[PDB]
Amino acid sequence: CKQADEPCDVFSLDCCTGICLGVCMW
């Protein structure tokens, strides 16, 4: 996944707790 403030794809996996609207917003 990605730690808060990490860039990722907002479609499947990104932040270990939610989504990716630019970067983990949590």
Please state the domain extents for the chain. 1-26
Over its C-alpha atoms, the chain yields an Rg (Å, rounded) of 7
The number of beta carbons lying within 10 Å of the beta carbon of residue 8 is: 17
**Which method resolved this structure?**
NMR
Q: How many CB atoms lie within 10 A of CB 14?
A: 21
User: Alpha carbon 16 to chain centroid distance?
Assistant: 7
> Three-class SS string for 1-26?
CCCCCCCCCCCCCCCCCCCCCCCCCC
With a CB cutoff of 8 Å and minimum separation 6, the contacts of 19 are 10, 25
Q: Cβ contacts of residue 24 below 8 Å, gap of 6+?
A: 1, 2, 3, 4, 5, 6, 8, 14, 15, 16, 17, 18
